Design a protein around this ligand. Structure first.
Ligand SMILES: NC(=O)c1ccc[n+]([C@@H]2O[C@H](COP(=O)([O-])OP(=O)([O-])OC[C@H]3O[C@@H](n4cnc5c(N)[nH+]cnc54)[C@H](O)[C@@H]3O)[C@@H](O)[C@H]2O)c1
Ligand SMILES: NC(=O)c1ccc[n+]([C@@H]2O[C@H](COP(=O)([O-])OP(=O)([O-])OC[C@H]3O[C@@H](n4cnc5c(N)[nH+]cnc54)[C@H](O)[C@@H]3O)[C@@H](O)[C@H]2O)c1
Ligand SMILES: [Zn+2]
Ligand SMILES: [Zn+2]
Ligand SMILES: [Zn+2]
Ligand SMILES: [Zn+2]
Lengths: 374, 374
C-alpha cells in the first residue's frame, strides 16, 4: 500500500530555464486535507509548458511542469468528497473553487484560486508536496503532471468517465478545451460566419474544430509554417494563408479576402504583433477578436484605440472560458458520445522517459501534440 | 421661394485650428439627388466639435463643424423619400445607408458611408455644398450643423415627431444617445451590477443615466473636476471619486472599492491612459470596458494583453451602438413619453451668434451642454 506514505517515483524536473528536463526520482508527500494524490497515465506536451522552459511564462523554479494530463486517483486526504481512489481524473490547471465571485458568476471561469496571475508554485496551503535531492520543488498551476504521481487540491481535479481512454482525453485538460471553448463559448461563433485563426498548433486546430461545430461558412487558417495547413483543412479550415507569401500585411490580405473583415478572429500563437493583427482583421464595426496565446512575460502591445471605437470587441480567455470542474466531465462524456474528435491533434505518442524528445518535436515544428505515457 | 436656389446665411466657419469660429455669411447650395437641405433650429456644443478646433480629431479645414442638432427641412432633392419639407429632423453624424454589410448586420451601426474613419469633409458625392468668401468649405461628419442652413445626404437625416421640442431633442443627435446606448446596448449593463464611469460630461452623464436605467446597484463616477459630482449624483451616481485625491492609481482604488473589480467600466474622456485604467478596473475574469472617448489623432496606447487573457472584454462604439436612422425617431418618441430626461444635460443656453462664448464655457469646465438657438 502507498496510501499515507511518501512515494518515491520518477518525474521530469526543470531545475532552471532553457535546459532539458531531468528525469529522476522525487518524493511525493501524501495528500493533506482536501488534497488528492494521482497516479499519472498520460500527459500532453503543451506549448505553455515550453513557455516555462523558455522564460515566456514565469513561474518559480525548480519546478515539475505539465498541466495537460489524465490519471487515476491513488489516495485522498481528509475531507475529499468529489473523487475516490481508483477514479479516472483530469487535473484542472484553472481551478473551480465554487465559492469566489468568479465561480459564482455565470460567465466567469478564471477562479480566484488560480496560480496563473501571480504564480507561487505551491499547493493552496502555500507548501509543496515534492522533494528532489533533498530540495523542495515547485508545483505548476496546481497540477504538475510531468511526474508518475502528483498531489493536487480538490478544486483542481475532476472525476471523469471510468471507461475513458486516458491517452486521448488528457487533451481535454488543456488544448482541446481551450481552443474549442474559445470558439464556441468565448467568441460565440455564429452560423454562416467567416473566422480567421492565427496559429495552427494544437490550440488553433481546436479553435477550427469549434468554429466548424458552430457552423462557420469560412475558416481561414493563418500560419508561417505551411506544413500545418493539411491538418488544418482536415479539421475544417476552408483556406490557409502564410503571411510570408504576401507583400502586404496579412491583416490587409484577410480584410480583402473577407470583403471588409472577418466576423471572428483568434490569436493562437502568443505574439504581440499577431494579437494586434488579429484584432485589425476583424470587421471594424461588429468583429470580435479573441486572444488565446500567452504573451511574453511583462511585455505590452501598442495599438490604436480607434480599432475598438468603431465597434470591435476584443477579449481573451483561459481554458476556453470553461468552468473547469463542471465542464471537463461533460466534455469527456461528449467525446465518448462521438461529439468531437481528439485523434487529429495527436501526432506522436512516446514514453514519459522521452519527454525531452517530445519537446524537441514541438520546437522543431514537427508535432501538434505528443502524448507521453507513463 | 428658396427651393432650388442658393441660400445665403450665417454659419460659424473654422478657418484654422486653435482659433475662434468666424460667424459670417456662407452660400449653401441647393440639394442634389438624395440630399436634404435643413433650416437649423438648435445645435449643441459637443466636446467632439472642440476636438476639431484642437486638432484632437483631424478633419479637413476650413470646415463648418457641428453634429448634434435639430431642424426643419427646407427642401429635398430628387428621389428623397424619407423626409419632406416642413418635417422636423435630426442630422445623423453616423449615417444609416441600410445597404452595407454593417447596416445589414443585427448589431452593427458604424455604416460604411461614415466620414469619421477617414474624414474627407464632403457630401457622399465627394463635393461641398458650402462656399464662403468665394472659397469651398468642408463639411463635418456629413452634418455641419453650425450653420443656419445645411445640406446632408438622405442617409444622414432622420424624421422625428412633429411635436418634438427641438431645443431639447437635439441632444439625441449625439451626447445623450451615445452615452445611454453605450450602457444599455454596447455594455449591456445588468441589474445589480457595479459600474464605473470615467468622465462626467454630457456623454458620461448619459452613460450614468443608462446604467441606472439598466438597474445597476452601484455607479461610481470618476472625474478630476469635483464640480461635476453633484450632477452625476442627481442622474444616478452612487459615489464619485477624484483620482487627484488618492496616492494610489485610480484603477487600484476602484478595484478595492468594488471588492475585486467592477462589472462594467466606461471611458468617456478621450485619453489613452484612462482607456487602459478603465479596462484595468473591471473584474479580470468577467468585466467589460467600453471606450466612448475620442482619442488624440493617430496616437497608440500601450497595454499588457494579460488584462484580456484573464477574461476581460474590451470594446468601443460610435453613437452608443445605435443604428442611427432607425433609432433616433424612437428615442425622440421615448423622450416625448418621459422615458428619459434631457434637461439634466442642458446647463446653458445661448444664441448661435454667441458660439465662441459657448466654447469658452465648455473649455473652462463650467458647462455640460450649451444649446445654441438659431
Ligand atoms: N489561453 C489558454 O488557456 C491557453 C491554453 C493553451 C494554449 N495557450 C497558448 O496558445 C498558444 C498556442 O499553443 P499551441 O497551439 O499549443 O502551440 P503551437 O503548437 O506552438 O502552435 C503555434 C503555431 O503558431 C505558428 N506561428 C508562430 N509564429 C507565427 C506567426 N508569426 N504567424 C502565424 N503563425 C505563427 C507556429 O508555426 C505554430 O504552428 C501558446 O502561446 C500557448 O501558450 C493558451
Ligand atoms: N463615441 C462617440 O460616438 C462619442 C460621442 C460623443 C462624445 N464622444 C467623446 O466622449 C468624450 C467625452 O465627451 P463629453 O462628455 O461631451 O466631454 P466633456 O464635457 O469634455 O467631458 C469629459 C470629462 O472628463 C473629465 N476629465 C478630463 N480629464 C480627466 C482625467 N484624467 N480623469 C478623469 N476625468 C477627466 C473632465 O473634467 C470632463 O468633465 C470626448 O472625447 C468626446 O469626443 C464620443
Ligand atoms: Zn473560485
Ligand atoms: Zn496548456
Ligand atoms: Zn450602411
Ligand atoms: Zn458628439
Amino acid at each position: 500500500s502507498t496510501a499515507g506514505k511518501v512515494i518515491k517515483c520518477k518525474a521530469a524536473v526543470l531545475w532552471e530555464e532553457k535546459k532539458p528536463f531531468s528525469i529522476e526520482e522525487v518524493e511525493v508527500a501524501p495528500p493533506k486535507a482536501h488534497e488528492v494524490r494521482i497516479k499519472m497515465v498520460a500527459t500532453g506536451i503543451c506549448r505553455s509548458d515550453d513557455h516555462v522552459v523558455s522564460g515566456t511564462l514565469v513561474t518559480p523554479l525548480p519546478v515539475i511542469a505539465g498541466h495537460e494530463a489524465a490519471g487515476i486517483v491513488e489516495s485522498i486526504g481528509e475531507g475529499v468528497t468529489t473523487v475516490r481512489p481508483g477514479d479516472k481524473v483530469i487535473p484542472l490547471f484553472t481551478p473551480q473553487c465554487g465559492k469566489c465571485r468568479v465561480c459564482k458568476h455565470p460567465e466567469g471561469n478564471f477562479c480566484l484560486k488560480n496560480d496563473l496571475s501571480m504564480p507561487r508554485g505551491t499547493m493552496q496551503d502555500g507548501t509543496s508536496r515534492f522533494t528532489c535531492r533533498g530540495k523542495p520543488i515547485h508545483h505548476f498551476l496546481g497540477t504538475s503532471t510531468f511526474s508518475q504521481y502528483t498531489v493536487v487540491d480538490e478544486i483542481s481535479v475532476a472525476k471523469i468517465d471510468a471507461a475513458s481512454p486516458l491517452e486521448k482525453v488528457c487533451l481535454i485538460g488543456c488544448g482541446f478545451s481551450t481552443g474549442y471553448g474559445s470558439a464556441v463559448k468565448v467568441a460565440k461563433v455564429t452560423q454562416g460566419s467567416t473566422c480567421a485563426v492565427f496559429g495552427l498548433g494544437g490550440a488553433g486546430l481546436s479553435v477550427i474544430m469549434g468554429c466548424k461545430a458552430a457552423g462557420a461558412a469560412r475558416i481561414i487558417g493563418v500560419d508561417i509554417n505551411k506544413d500545418k495547413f493539411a491538418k488544418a483543412k482536415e479539421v475544417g479550415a476552408t483556406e490557409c494563408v502564410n503571411p510570408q507569401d504576401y507583400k502586404k500585411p496579412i491583416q490587409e490580405v484577410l480584410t480583402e479576402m473577407s470583403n471588409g473583415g472577418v466576423d471572428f478572429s483568434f490569436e493562437v500563437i502568443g505574439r504581440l504583433d499577431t494579437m494586434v493583427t488579429a484584432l485589425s482583421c476583424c470587421q471594424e464595426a461588429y468583429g470580435v477578436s479573441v486572444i488565446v496565446g500567452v504573451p511574453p512575460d511583462s511585455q505590452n502591445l501598442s495599438m490604436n484605440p480607434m480599432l475598438l471605437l468603431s465597434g470591435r470587441t476584443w477579449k481573451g480567455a483561459i481554458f476556453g472560458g470553461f468552468k473547469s470542474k463542471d465542464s471537463v466531465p461533460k466534455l469527456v462524456a461528449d467525446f465518448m458520445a462521438k461529439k468531437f474528435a481528439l485523434d487529429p491533434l495527436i501526432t506522436h505518442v512516446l514514453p514519459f522517459e522521452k519527454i525531452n524528445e517530445g519537446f524537441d518535436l514541438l520546437r522543431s515544428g514537427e508535432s501538434i501534440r505528443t502524448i507521453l505515457t507513463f
